[PDB]
Design an enzyme around this catalytic site. Structure first.
Site, PDB file in Angstrom:
ATOM      1  N   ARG B  56       0.853  -1.201   0.000  1.00  0.00           N
ATOM      2  CA  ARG B  56       0.000   0.000   0.000  1.00  0.00           C
ATOM      3  C   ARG B  56       0.882   1.242   0.000  1.00  0.00           C
ATOM      4  O   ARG B  56       0.642   2.197  -0.755  1.00  0.00           O
ATOM      5  CB  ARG B  56      -0.924   0.039   1.209  1.00  0.00           C
ATOM      6  CG  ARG B  56      -1.977  -1.055   1.215  1.00  0.00           C
ATOM      7  CD  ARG B  56      -3.033  -0.732   2.255  1.00  0.00           C
ATOM      8  NE  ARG B  56      -4.033  -1.798   2.227  1.00  0.00           N
ATOM      9  CZ  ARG B  56      -3.968  -2.897   2.968  1.00  0.00           C
ATOM     10  NH1 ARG B  56      -2.970  -3.062   3.825  1.00  0.00           N
ATOM     11  NH2 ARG B  56      -4.906  -3.835   2.859  1.00  0.00           N
ATOM     12  N   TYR B  72      -5.577   1.325 -11.932  1.00  0.00           N
ATOM     13  CA  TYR B  72      -5.367   0.547 -10.723  1.00  0.00           C
ATOM     14  C   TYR B  72      -4.341  -0.618 -10.825  1.00  0.00           C
ATOM     15  O   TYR B  72      -3.333  -0.614 -10.107  1.00  0.00           O
ATOM     16  CB  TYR B  72      -6.712  -0.014 -10.263  1.00  0.00           C
ATOM     17  CG  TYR B  72      -6.590  -0.836  -9.018  1.00  0.00           C
ATOM     18  CD1 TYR B  72      -6.649  -0.233  -7.769  1.00  0.00           C
ATOM     19  CD2 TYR B  72      -6.416  -2.226  -9.079  1.00  0.00           C
ATOM     20  CE1 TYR B  72      -6.537  -0.965  -6.623  1.00  0.00           C
ATOM     21  CE2 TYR B  72      -6.291  -2.985  -7.917  1.00  0.00           C
ATOM     22  CZ  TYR B  72      -6.358  -2.348  -6.696  1.00  0.00           C
ATOM     23  OH  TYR B  72      -6.237  -3.060  -5.524  1.00  0.00           O
ATOM     24  N   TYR B  76      -0.111  -1.392  -9.118  1.00  0.00           N
ATOM     25  CA  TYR B  76       0.440  -2.520  -8.351  1.00  0.00           C
ATOM     26  C   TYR B  76       1.593  -3.225  -9.057  1.00  0.00           C
ATOM     27  O   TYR B  76       2.513  -3.706  -8.398  1.00  0.00           O
ATOM     28  CB  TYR B  76      -0.680  -3.477  -7.885  1.00  0.00           C
ATOM     29  CG  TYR B  76      -1.557  -2.699  -6.915  1.00  0.00           C
ATOM     30  CD1 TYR B  76      -1.268  -2.661  -5.551  1.00  0.00           C
ATOM     31  CD2 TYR B  76      -2.564  -1.849  -7.400  1.00  0.00           C
ATOM     32  CE1 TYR B  76      -2.046  -1.869  -4.663  1.00  0.00           C
ATOM     33  CE2 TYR B  76      -3.315  -1.039  -6.549  1.00  0.00           C
ATOM     34  CZ  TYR B  76      -3.056  -1.056  -5.183  1.00  0.00           C
ATOM     35  OH  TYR B  76      -3.828  -0.261  -4.377  1.00  0.00           O
TER      36      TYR B  76
END
Ligand SMILES: [Fe+3]
Lengths: 190, 211
Positions: B56, B72, B76
């Site tokens: 995170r 999104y 990551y």
């Protein structure tokens, strides 16, 4: 130029380049394929829990969500501590992760693009009535809206109200869509 | 970290791109999209190289413009890649070689993090609490909209977890704390400029103090 994007290789190329790890023996055989769990096992299961709660005053789910979910064997990654939040004739619950995308994966499925959107993350905490309305859900003026921001390890599911016209239906009840579990939709009877 | 990721309450965004029960298509809309999560779990569960909290935080550490333009799942890919480089497992050279082009990463951390506070209070359901009026440059699981605000305890968790402000930097001193569901009136958070009723934030014990 000012405020310009950094030059980048195609994302597919970057993602597969990261998958560098495999060439160093750091990824077990069949590992990412196994996880790709995401498509078949993690699934909005949540509907099953809701239908059970609706027909079995199990509705355990509201006091010890983790235990209730464990009975079905549906605990898992991003779904280890579960709290179910109950809609009432005066209360509508809605879930977000304003800081990222936190979601009860095993019972709701991985979050949809819209839930991860900056629009949802920014707006639902401050104007949930307008957001829901725009999405097609009109919340009556006599109903309080409560937004749960998923900021730690609690993973939430909404227990929506059981709509009239479903009396006597079989656990048929499982009209409980992904959006019902997140809290942006109300279950609809055909 | 008061980064652009702390989006709750930001004004100026348009419509959420969804109407209720609309078809959202397959879980993964491209053949690579399962990789960021899969490789995060490799790092966390198989290698023990970092925590989920570090993932995170490394995403929060994306350069702000970069964060704002990146979908999104791509965030990551960038975050996990960054952690593998920071932990000395991979090099950026090899990533860019294999990618056949630029692979910019998240920015270095500007904070070493902070330990779980030694002094905290065990709160009970119904008690009024205030969110500690504190500024943390590293990882924190308190959205700014609740800083210094007052609400009521709805739930104390029956489990405890490491303090994100520590484990999010891979520190050894994250201890363990329960979290609290703290209910705020919408007007406590946004004054007259909200259409909501209440907002419940899941806050670590170390973010709270008696009201
Ligand atoms: Fe999240």
């Amino acid at each position: 130029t000012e405020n310009a994007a950094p030059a980048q290789a195609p994302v597919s190329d970057r993602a597969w380049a990261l998958f560098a790890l495999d060439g160093k023996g750091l990824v077990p055989d069949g590992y990412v394929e196994g996880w790709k769990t995401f498509e078949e096992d993690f699934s909005p299961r949540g509907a099953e829990l809701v239908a059970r709660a609706w027909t079995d005053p199990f509705r355990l789910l509201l006091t010890d969500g983790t235990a209730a979910v464990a009975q079905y064997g549906y605990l898992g990654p991003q779904g280890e501590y579960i709290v179910a939040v109950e809609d009432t004739p005066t209360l509508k619950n809605v879930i977000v992760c304003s800081l990222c995308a936190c979601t009860a994966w095993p019972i709701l499925g991985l979050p949809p693009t819209w839930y991860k959107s900056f629009e949802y993350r920014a707006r639902v905490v401050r104007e949930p009535r307008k957001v829901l309305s725009e999405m097609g859900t009109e919340i009556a003026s006599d109903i309080e809206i409560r937004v749960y921001d998923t900021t730690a390890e609690t993973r939430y599911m909404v227990l929506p109200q059981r709509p009239a016209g479903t009396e006597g239906w079989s656990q048929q009840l499982q009209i409980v869509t992904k959006d019902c579990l997140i809290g942006v939709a109300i279950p609809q009877v055909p | 970290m008061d980064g652009v990721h702390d989006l709750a309450g930001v004004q100026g965004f348009g419509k959420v791109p969804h109407t209720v029960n609309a078809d959202i298509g397959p879980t993964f809309h491209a053949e690579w999209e399962h990789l960021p999560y899969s490789l995060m779990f490799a790092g966390v569960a198989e290698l023990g190289a970092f925590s989920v909290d570090e993932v995170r935080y490394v995403v929060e550490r994306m350069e702000p413009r970069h964060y704002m333009m990146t979908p999104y799942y791509e965030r990551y890919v960038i975050g996990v890649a960054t952690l593998m480089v920071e932990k000395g497992i991979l090099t950026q050279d090899e990533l860019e070689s294999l990618a056949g082009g630029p692979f910019p990463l998240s920015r270095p951390s500007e904070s070493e993090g902070r330990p779980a506070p030694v002094e905290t209070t065990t709160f009970e359901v119904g008690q009024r609490v205030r969110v500690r009026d504190e500024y943390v440059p590293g990882h924190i699981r308190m959205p700014a909209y609740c800083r210094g605000r007052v609400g009521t305890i709805s739930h104390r968790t029956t489990e405890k977890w490491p303090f994100p402000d520590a484990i999010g930097h891979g520190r050894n001193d994250a201890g363990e704390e329960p979290t609290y569901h703290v209910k705020f009136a919408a007007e406590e958070l946004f004054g007259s400029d909200t259409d909501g009723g209440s907002v419940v934030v899941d806050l670590f014990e170390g973010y709270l103090e008696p009201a």
